[PDB]
Amino acid sequence: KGKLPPGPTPLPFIGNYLQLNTEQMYNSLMKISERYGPVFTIHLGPRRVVVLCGHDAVREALVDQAEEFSGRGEQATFDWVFKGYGVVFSNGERAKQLRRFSIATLRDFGVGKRGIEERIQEEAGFLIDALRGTGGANIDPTFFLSRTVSNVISSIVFGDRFDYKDKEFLSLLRMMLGIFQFTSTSTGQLYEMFSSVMKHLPGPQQQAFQLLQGLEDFIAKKVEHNQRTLDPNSPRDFIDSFLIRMQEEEKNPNTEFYLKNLVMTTLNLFIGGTETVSTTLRYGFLLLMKHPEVEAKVHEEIDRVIGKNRQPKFEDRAKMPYMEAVIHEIQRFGDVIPMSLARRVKKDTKFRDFFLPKGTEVYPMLGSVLRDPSFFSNPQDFNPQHFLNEKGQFKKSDAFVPFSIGKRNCFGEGLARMELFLFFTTVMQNFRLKSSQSPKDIDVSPKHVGFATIPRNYTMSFLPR
Numbered sequence: 001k002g003k004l005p006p007g008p009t010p011l012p013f014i015g016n017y018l019q020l021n022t023e024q025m026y027n028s029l030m031k032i033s034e035r036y037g038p039v040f041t042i043h044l045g046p047r048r049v050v051v052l053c054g055h056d057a058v059r060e061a062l063v064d065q066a067e068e069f070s071g072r073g074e075q076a077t078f079d080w081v082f083k084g085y086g087v088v089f090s091n092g093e094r095a096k097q098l099r100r101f102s103i104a105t106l107r108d109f110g111v112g113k114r115g116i117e118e119r120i121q122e123e124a125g126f127l128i129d130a131l132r133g134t135g136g137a138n139i140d141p142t143f144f145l146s147r148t149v150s151n152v153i154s155s156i157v158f159g160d161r162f163d164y165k166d167k168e169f170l171s172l173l174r175m176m177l178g179i180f181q182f183t184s185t186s187t188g189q190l191y192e193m194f195s196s197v198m199k200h201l202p203g204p205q206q207q208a209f210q211l212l213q214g215l216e217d218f219i220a221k222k223v224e225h226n227q228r229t230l231d232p233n234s235p236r237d238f239i240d241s242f243l244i245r246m247q248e249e250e251k252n253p254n255t256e257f258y259l260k261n262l263v264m265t266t267l268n269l270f271i272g273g274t275e276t277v278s279t280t281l282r283y284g285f286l287l288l289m290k291h292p293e294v295e296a297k298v299h300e301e302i303d304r305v306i307g308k309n310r311q312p313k314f315e316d317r318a319k320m321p322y323m324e325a326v327i328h329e330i331q332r333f334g335d336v337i338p339m340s341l342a343r344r345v346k347k348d349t350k351f352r353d354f355f356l357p358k359g360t361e362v363y364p365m366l367g368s369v370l371r372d373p374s375f376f377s378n379p380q381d382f383n384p385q386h387f388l389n390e391k392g393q394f395k396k397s398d399a400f401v402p403f404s405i406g407k408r409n410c411f412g413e414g415l416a417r418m419e420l421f422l423f424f425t426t427v428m429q430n431f432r433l434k435s436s437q438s439p440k441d442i443d444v445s446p447k448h449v450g451f452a453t454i455p456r457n458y459t460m461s462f463l464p465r
């Protein structure tokens with residue numbers, strides 16, 4: 001054919017806005033999909049975007065044509081602060097250099113090794129202390145979980161953890177929570193279409209920008225301090241390593257290693273390494289309370305494999321297929337980043353029988369893959385069996401793509417999985433979960449869905465086992 005995937009006819013500037021509900025972008029797009037097919041074109045305001053629904057379409061593009069779909073598209077709210085700098089929301093050589101450096105440096109600081117495993121186990125011990133500190137009282141688990149998760153990536157990028165009582169630490173965590181929420185609201189999704197006008201208007205979006213600026217200012221301040229105390233021969237953290245590279249690249253006019261990329265890359269890792277794992281833990285505990293039978297089976301496995309005294313360790317996962325299936329099912333059901341981070345084609349592309357001109361933005365609908373009816377028997381239910389065969393052994397799925405896939409896939413995946421396993425296992429070894437309401441009445445549908453999937457606010461109690 002040589003034409004763009006088909007889709008609803010757009011109007012000048014507003015695009016397909018009148019055919020979408022900003023409060024329910026995923027549903028709006030899936031509905032349109034029913035009429036046009038799994039691969040179609042939508043206009044988010046002036047942004048022409050090719051939407052990919054279901055496993056095959058997503059894998060065929062992002063993996064079978066990985067290089068062609070390896071460009072980074074827009075996320076207007078994050079782009080407000082990043083402006084094309086840093087490692088996530090950037091493109092070309094800049095992204096390429098920053099990604100190679102970040103992965104190497106994260107490994108240098110223990111990621112994927114015993115070094116970060118020990119860091120996570122230690123922070124998990126501090127979480128257990130904090131939960132015991134509540135005395136079994138009903139509490140909002142939100143910041144208990146985020147403080148613990150954030151301290152892992154914080155020890156890597158800033159060299160030391162934050163004290164749980166540090167008020168500024170709480171403030172940064174509120175900024176992250178607030179920005180993920182804003183991007184998942186109707187206004188945050190309206191912003192994705194009309195940022196050209198909205199970035200200049202009063203409104204909720206301005207408060208969101210101020211939370212991003214607050215996070216940026218905090219990182220700039222930390223960088224300054226490291227700068228004046230830096231030992232080129234003994235880096236303390238991610239920031240020092242980057243400062244050293246900047247030093248070594250000072251004679252290169254075209255280097256990507258300069259202050260703005262240092263600040264933005266560090267900001268990407270601080271927010272990235274915090275909010276998504278935190279949200280997943282929070283959703284996870286809610287699902288476990290909605291499903292006591294699953295919690296009960298987790299406890300049998302933990303007591304048998306690990307016991308009551310030693311701390312869980314990452315190698316324990318190989319002997320714990322049920323917990324591994326449970327964590328996969330939480331990520332599959334949570335669908336935390338439902339439309340991934342937009343990609344864009346690097347050059348003119350032929351995909352299936354369509355034509356995608358260079359620069360065209362792409363929405364890989366991860367959530368449509370995680371709930372693909374050809375890969376999961378009951379996609380709309382929380383059921384760990386989705387990841388187990390008949391002998392209760394762990395069974396992988398090609399449709400398990402919460403970290404996306406391809407050339408710009410999440411390089412925080414190994415760290416995330418290690419955190420999820422050790423935090424879920426250590427909490428559940430130590431506590432049984434008590435909801436403030438009957439399981440039948442627990443509502444696990446999300447509170448907001450847009451850029452992220454946000455669970456409803458809730459309180460619960462952690463009772464020692």
Ligand code: HEM
Nearest residue numbers: 088272273276277337340341402403404408409410412416
């Ligand atoms: C449950 C946790 C997490 C989920 C579900 C998740 C998900 C994702 C997704 C869907 C993307 C976009 C991938 C693409 O464009 O194809 C992404 C990218 C990225 N993630 Fe994560 N992530 C998680 C944790 C983390 C953590 C802990 C870190 C940090 C160490 C991190 C760092 C990044 C970075 C730097 C990128 C951008 C990669 C690039 O542009 O080349 N993520 N993540």
Ligand SMILES: CN(C)Cc1ccc(-c2cccnc2)o1
Nearest residue numbers: 078088267268271272273276412
């Ligand atoms: C890190 N993973 C979770 C991908 C992801 C979702 C949202 C963001 C993110 C948002 C602001 C700054 N840096 C990164 O990054």
